[PDB]
Amino acid sequence: GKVIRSLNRFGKKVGNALTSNTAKKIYSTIGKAAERFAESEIGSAAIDGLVQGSVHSIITGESYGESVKQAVLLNVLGSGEEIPDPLSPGERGIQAKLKELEDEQRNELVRLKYNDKIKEKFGKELEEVYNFMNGEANAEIEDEKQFDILNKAVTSYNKILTEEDLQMRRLATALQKEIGERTHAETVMVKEYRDKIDALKNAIEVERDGMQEEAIQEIAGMTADVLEAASEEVPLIGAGMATAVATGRAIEGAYKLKKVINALSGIDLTHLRTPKIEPSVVSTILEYRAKEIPDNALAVSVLSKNRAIQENHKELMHIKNEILPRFKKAMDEEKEICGIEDKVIHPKVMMKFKIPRAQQPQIHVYSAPWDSDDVFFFHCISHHHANESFFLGFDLSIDLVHYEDLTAHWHALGAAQTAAGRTLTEAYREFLNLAISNAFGTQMHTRRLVRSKTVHPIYLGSLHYDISFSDLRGNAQRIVYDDELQMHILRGPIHFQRRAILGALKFGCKVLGDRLDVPL
């Protein structure tokens, strides 16, 4: 479903100048709705106070007009990170190998502190995979083909996922169940989690009272090791007075599962991730400004993180059921046809499943091929297990956004869905032609050869998003539909509006302040 709205900005309008009638109308329709359902007599009386009040609040809300609330990007910062400019592959590509390093370093002491207790739950398998990578050689060895180790890494990784999932689902129903219904073990688990959320509410509220008077930023910025303690819904092993929560995104990588899978088969799984705080939690805490948020709201946000972790699980199952068997078949067929020993996995077997880098399930950033930083667009791609993607492009000069669902992707390791959908190509073709035909407040455009008819985006790399793909698509919707979001999010130097658009896409952004309901 293509959509080509245009962005709002504060200097607009200016100015209709009626300026009332909102009072005259809200009374006129309110009187007619009473004329339909059995007269005005009941309200004359107590309801007229409600009307007069809502009209009053509505009117003074109208008095402010344009008007700039302060709005945050729901991602706690925390540690040295910024949000990369989505238009300098340098900056953002650094930021990826940087997160892989801080991560490998910090997971490592999850493996240190919890090794034996982890060998209890998932046990014997994980440590074998971690040894297969960085453990010293040369014993016991022999037991033992690489393809078995690849399978061991996957199945064990899936063992972690169904554990994290089953645990989240148990905590969410516990949050729902409400006191008399809750078992003892569940009251305890809800009480713990509720307390962690109180630490967080306290943090966010202190961070937010200290924010400037019209600010855009990230809501809060605590060091990752501390926020993990104050926020992880479901630690997977009981934290015996060490630090390092065994988050299980931690065990995923404490043991190098993802990394060994990727180093054996060619398959990249870096895109299986979860937000470090669920954005909807930061959102709930934000709109219960100081008034203990109910168990149900908590369970909603827990379920909401759970759907992202269920997405990872489904991707994993797509790799295990649809692609490992294909990988085996290709491997021993490689041995058959020109072996190529099949003790080791030879690289031409890995390359047999190698999708083009532009279609990894991340956010890909393209840019117009001429000269502005005005035009650019994201192609966001989603998990292979369900491989729909979309197109979200901006021309910040003739302020307009252009959103569009794209089609299936027939590459080597997508699922087969039905073609939707335009190509990525049809989409940016029309988008860039629109950006060019709309330009008449600059000369010498395009300046491209043969005077247009015509042009193609310059591709610029990509970044991972941590929320679920449908949460991402919901953020892109909310960028093209919400006028107030666009006004706030589109503000500083052009380079900052770019950073902020990527922010509100990648984490989501919520504007602050209050609202009141209408009777009729």
32: in domain? no
Same domain, 329 and 279: yes
Say if residue 364 is in the same domain as residue 339. no
Output phi, psi for 448, to 5 deg: -70, 155
DSSP helix/strand/coil, 71 = strand
Name the domain boundary from 318, 353, 388.
Answer: 353
Number of domains in the chain: 2
Q: Is residue 296 part of a domain?
A: yes
Q: What are phi and psi of 487, to 5 degrees?
A: -60, -40
Q: Is residue 35 part of a domain?
A: no
Q: Which two tokens stand for residue 352?
A: 């047999």
For residue 258, what are its two tokens? 């993802």
Looking at the fold, whether 324 and 387 belong to one and the same domain comes out as no
Asked if residue 432 and residue 337 are part of one domain, the reply reads no
Q: Judge whether 229 and 246 are in contact, CB under 8 Å.
A: no
The angle at the Cα of 149, spanning 145 to 152, to the nearest 5 degrees, equals 140
Q: Given the structure tokens 């009386």, which residue do they identify?
A: 45
Strands 71-73 and 216-218, how do they pair? parallel
**301 and 435 share a domain?**
no
Q: Are residues 177 and 255 in the same domain?
A: yes
**Residues in the chain that come right before a backbone break, where C and next N are over 2.5 Å apart:** 143, 453
Does residue 109 share a domain with residue 79?
yes
Question: Do β-strands 509-511 and 216-218 pair in parallel, antiparallel, or remain unpaired?
Answer: unpaired
Contacts of residue 486, defined as CB under 8 A and 6 or more positions apart, other chains included, come to 7, 8, 9, 401, 479
Residues 84 and 218 in one domain: yes
Residues 379 and 279 placed together within one structural domain of the fold: no
Q: Do the Cβ atoms of 230 and 243 come closer than 8 Å?
A: no
| Tokens coding 72 | 């945050």
Residue 62 counted as domain residue: no
Domain that holds residue 326: 68-353
CA nearest to 118, candidates 105, 109, 127:
127
Which two tokens mark 337?
Answer: 């046809």
Looking at the structure, do residues 344 and 395 belong to the same domain, yes or no? no
In a domain? residue 118: yes
Q: How far apart are CA 484 and CA 482, in angstroms?
A: 6
Q: Which approach determined this entry?
A: cryo-EM
Helix, strand or coil, per DSSP, at residue 79? coil
Kindly report the length of the chain.
520
Q: Listing from the earlier edge strand, what are the strands of the sheet with 71-73?
A: 216-218, 71-73, 509-511
**H-type alpha helices, 19-145:** 22-37, 46-64, 89-113, 115-121, 124-132
Q: Are 218 and 72 in contact (CB under 8 A)?
A: yes
Among 353, 388, 418, identify where a domain stops: 353
* Tokens coding 505: 């896409």
One-letter amino acid at 159 equals K
Is there a contact between 305 and 169 (Cβ–Cβ < 8 Å)? no
Strand partners, 510: 72
Both 310 and 176 in one domain: the answer is yes
| 275, 143: one domain | yes
Q: At what angle do helices 22-37 and 46-64 cross, to 10 degrees?
A: 150
Task: Pick the last residue of a domain from 353, 377, 393.
Answer: 353
What's the rounded Cα separation, in Å, for the pair 323 and 463? 24
